[PDB]
Design a protein around this nucleic acid. Structure first.
Ligand SMILES: Nc1ncnc2c1ncn2[C@@H]1O[C@H](COP(=O)(O)OP(=O)(O)OC[C@H]2O[C@H](O)[C@H](O)[C@@H]2O)[C@@H](O)[C@H]1O
Lengths: 16, 50, 151, 473, 51, 101, 101
DNA sequence: AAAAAAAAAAAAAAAA
């Protein structure tokens, strides 16, 4: 089992 | 009490807090092992608070 | 033709009430000029403000609070508005709005301590309806109400 | 990498046909949908508690300032926000003496003390409603703090304070709202601490419910509840397609009868001829025997969906073209077949299962902030995840405190477009009338249905319960 | 439909039921709040729904 | 020409009776001036009152109460009315109204 | 402590009386504040007068003439003087001086 | 009397 978590990809972000 | 650079066991007043995880295998989305995060506490660092 | 309503206030403290009042007046069809309403800032603003008060302003609403009572920018705006008031031969030009309960009528600024003020202290909507009746009484220029402009 | 799609944030409608993403800001600037001239308010409780209610009503008459307006909008004042007159003059007051309210409180049996405490209030409410000339739109019940400490299950009175029905639930609010249903009296309870908390002090000296920074949202969520219960339309949805009934099934346990009997409750949401929205309950509670079935038997399922298709028919004229039964429980084929038969040929029958059990937690790579609210990880055409709770820039924060948990939305039965289903439930998360927040973490059908289920299962003697939410939330 | 009934008692009971059911449904099953409910009745019913 | 009736009163307290009387008089065809209903916002209110009393007040009505007897604004309006009475040589210019038992 | 005497007047018309009275009072040992007394002007003076009338003035003397009777600056000074009179609870504060026949 | 895969009822804190 991989020790690195499954990564997804989001097309939208934000900033403080 | 810290793996890599990141602390896992810390102090808060008289309670030593520990980071813990719980695992569960699921195959419906993909062959996956799900992890949940939790925080527990001890009075002397070895015996858990009842 | 002067068709714009000017709202002076304390920018870092009285911004929310002025926001509400401007967004309601513009929705009702009254042209409103305020420093908050315009996004971005440049050195020209201080000139622009002045010329508006002298060229396009038809009514001057001064938000009265313990913050805006003795603020130098507010005092400068009040002074230029008063000079415009003498220039235009119109007494119903400066319309103070009292929104603070710790700012009693006793301690108003000397330029507007003698002027009747629309009372926003208790209920904001009562003050807004008073503003509306005053504006329609003084025939303030108005457009057909459109909340879409405010949105 | 796994693709993660985002749905447009739903918009809600306000006065003059104006639309706004937020609810508080839309109300503050545009105002309610309908004209509510005034709220004739009835107050019941102790005389010591009436002063606090009057003070709070005057307090909300004036605008309320919160800590940070960017994080959460301030409250411009009730009459300005709602265009509705709600003064502290003209409230119809009913008094509850301290001795009478204390006699029942100090009882050994929780069920008996709760029954007597509920009866003491409801009898006066009914007497005022039926034998008094005054008209009251809504009834505010201010209760003291000791009762709340000792009026809900597992509340053990101190041995020193004990001084001296089993068919009724031991919960004060549930039984209270249950026993007032046959009279259709809109009531909405206040605790003394929810009132001017500054009076209530702890050992340290700080208020127990210190709301110093958060008074504005408190006024926002109290005024909107009062406006809704008085007969007002706060806001409505505008993205709901014509011809779609939704309905939300929730199963609740009834402990009074032997075996839980698993009473089921439903709520509908659809449109009207024109543009009006209809959001009522469908309360025909269909009891399900067996301890843990949670699957509704064919006869009750047929009766339920037949009532739902009718209640659409008499109000619009024709049958719905697609009904999307959301449900926290999974549908088995037995009830689905029963649903299908009563369903006509033109109607598209869709059964959707929603769950928070799935342990998925997306952590952003860098930054002390959660994922954006609205992200959808579509597993397949029938199943997906949707983050109903998360960061949304307008609120400037996230709706959770820790990292939120998604909703596992799967089309259990029927076909349905997964993207369209994900585009609607997120809209259902915004029509919470009991609280004026930016959005709710779960769809309001699954929440209001649970509310009416918790209320309908408090009393055994319910007969033909009202289908309006005013009497429930 | 109800009004053209030979029996006065049955016809008046049905006419009252028709109005009362709608009023009860509106009071119990709608979010609107109504202070007073005005019941408009035509003249023919007035002529033929009383002793 | 003077065709106005000035109803001096205690504004913080006597609003109700003054409003009722002003509305009744207006409905009767009498042009009436009163601060609660006729005073413009954003004006020199003291100067406006003095001008109205001096030039436009044909008749002066004073609301007498336990409050209005010693209210400074009411007393100043009363004195200006007395001076206008001396100017106009009309002994019946001013009519007090007693409402407080 | 308030120990200044304020002399309000119509600036471009009542120079002679204000000058004579101020030069007399200062010689008599009374602190006097007036606009014609201070040499040079700036934008601050409009603010300055206000704080004086609210913070240092113990008596307020109003030159009464056909000019100063309806002068806007004189009116504003009179208003703030009346209100500080109210706040001090001292009725013998404003002392008018009529100089016109 | 276990297992995993699904259920609801309840109380407590911390924010919104
Ligand atoms: N800028 C203002 N300055 C003074 N008063 C104001 C202002 N704005 C509103 N008011 C209102 O003006 C009122 C001042 O009341 P008062 O003088 O103390 O007591 P009275 O019994 O002697 O009033 C009698 C006359 O004074 C009135 O001005 C009218 O001219 C009356 O004819 C307050 O309600 C204020 O909220």
């Amino acid at each position: 089992v991989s020790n690195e978590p499954v990564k997804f990809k989001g097309n939208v972000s934000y900033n403080i | 009490d810290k793996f890599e650079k990141t602390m896992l066991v810390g102090k808060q007043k008289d309670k030593n807090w520990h980071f813990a995880i719980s695992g569960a295998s699921k195959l419906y989305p993909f062959p996956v092992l799900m992890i949940s995060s939790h925080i527990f506490f001890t009075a002397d660092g070895k015996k858990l608070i009842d | 033709m002067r068709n714009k309503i000017f709202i002076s206030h304390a920018t870092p403290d009285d911004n929310d009430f002025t926001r509400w009042l401007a967004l309601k007046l513009i929705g009702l069809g009254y042209e409103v000029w305020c420093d908050i309403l315009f996004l971005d800032k440049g050195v020209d603003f201080w000139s622009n403000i002045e010329k508006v008060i002298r060229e396009d302003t038809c009514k001057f609403l001064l938000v009265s609070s313990s913050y805006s009572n003795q603020r130098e920018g507010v005092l400068k705006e009040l002074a230029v508005a008063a000079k415009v008031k003498k220039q235009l031969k119109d007494d119903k030009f400066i319309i103070p709005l009292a929104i603070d309960e710790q700012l009693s009528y006793d301690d108003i600024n000397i330029d507007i301590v003698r002027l009747n003020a629309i009372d926003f202290k208790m209920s904001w909507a009562r003050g807004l309806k008073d503003i509306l009746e005053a504006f329609e009484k003084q025939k303030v220029p108005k457009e057909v109400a459109d909340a879409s402009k405010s949105n | 990498m796994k693709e993660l799609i985002y749905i447009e944030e739903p918009k809600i409608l306000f006065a003059h046909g104006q639309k706004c993403t937020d609810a508080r800001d839309g109300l503050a600037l545009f105002g309610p949908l309908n004209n509510l001239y005034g709220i004739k308010s009835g107050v019941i409780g102790t005389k010591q508690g009436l002063k606090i209610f009057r003070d709070y009503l005057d307090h909300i008459q004036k605008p309320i300032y919160n800590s940070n307006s960017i994080t959460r909008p301030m409250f411009p004042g009730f009459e300005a926000v709602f265009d509705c007159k709600w003064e502290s003059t003209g409230i119809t007051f009913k008094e509850v003496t301290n001795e009478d309210i204390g006699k029942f409180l100090y009882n050994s049996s929780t069920h008996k003390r709760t029954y007597d405490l509920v009866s003491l209030f409801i009898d006066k409410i009914i007497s005022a409603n039926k034998n008094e000339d005054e008209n009251v739109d809504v009834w505010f019940v201010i209760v003291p703090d000791e009762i709340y400490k000792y009026c809900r299950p597992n509340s053990v009175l101190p041995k020193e304070m004990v001084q001296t029905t089993y068919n009724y639930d031991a919960q004060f609010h549930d039984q209270f709202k249950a026993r007032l249903l046959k009279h259709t009296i809109p009531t909405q309870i206040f605790r003394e601490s929810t009132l001017a908390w500054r009076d209530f002090k702890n050992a340290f000296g700080l208020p127990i419910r210190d709301f110093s920074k958060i008074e504005g949202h408190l006024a926002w969520t109290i005024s909107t509840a009062a406006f809704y219960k008085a007969g007002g339309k706060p806001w409505k949805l505008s993205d709901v397609r014509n011809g779609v009934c939704y309905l939300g099934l929730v199963y609740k346990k009834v402990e009074k009868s032997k075996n839980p009997r698993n009473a089921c409750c439903a709520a509908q949401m659809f449109l009207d001829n024109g543009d009006g929205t209809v959001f009522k309950g469908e309360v025909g509670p269909w009891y399900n025997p067996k301890n843990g079935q949670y699957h509704l038997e064919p006869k009750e399922a047929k009766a339920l969906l037949s009532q739902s298709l009718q209640s659409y028919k008499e109000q619009i004229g024709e049958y719905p073209k697609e009904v999307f039964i959301h449900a926290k429980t999974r549908f088995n084929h037995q009830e689905w077949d029963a649903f299908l038969e009563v369903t006509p040929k033109e109607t598209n029958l869709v059964g959707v299962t929603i769950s928070k059990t799935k342990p998925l937690k997306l952590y952003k790579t860098e930054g002390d902030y959660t994922i954006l609210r609205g992200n959808a990880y579509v597993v397949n055409e029938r199943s997906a995840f949707l983050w109903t709770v998360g960061y949304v820039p307008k609120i400037q924060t996230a709706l959770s405190m820790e990292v939120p948990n998604p909703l596992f939305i799967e089309i259990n039965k029927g076909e349905a477009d997964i993207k369209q289903v994900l585009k609607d439930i997120l809209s259902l998360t915004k029509l919470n009338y009991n609280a004026c927040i930016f959005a709710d973490g779960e769809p309001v059908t699954l929440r209001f249905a649970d509310k009416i289920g918790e209320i309908l299962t408090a009393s055994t003697d319910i007969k033909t319960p009202p289908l309006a939410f005013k009497y429930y939330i």
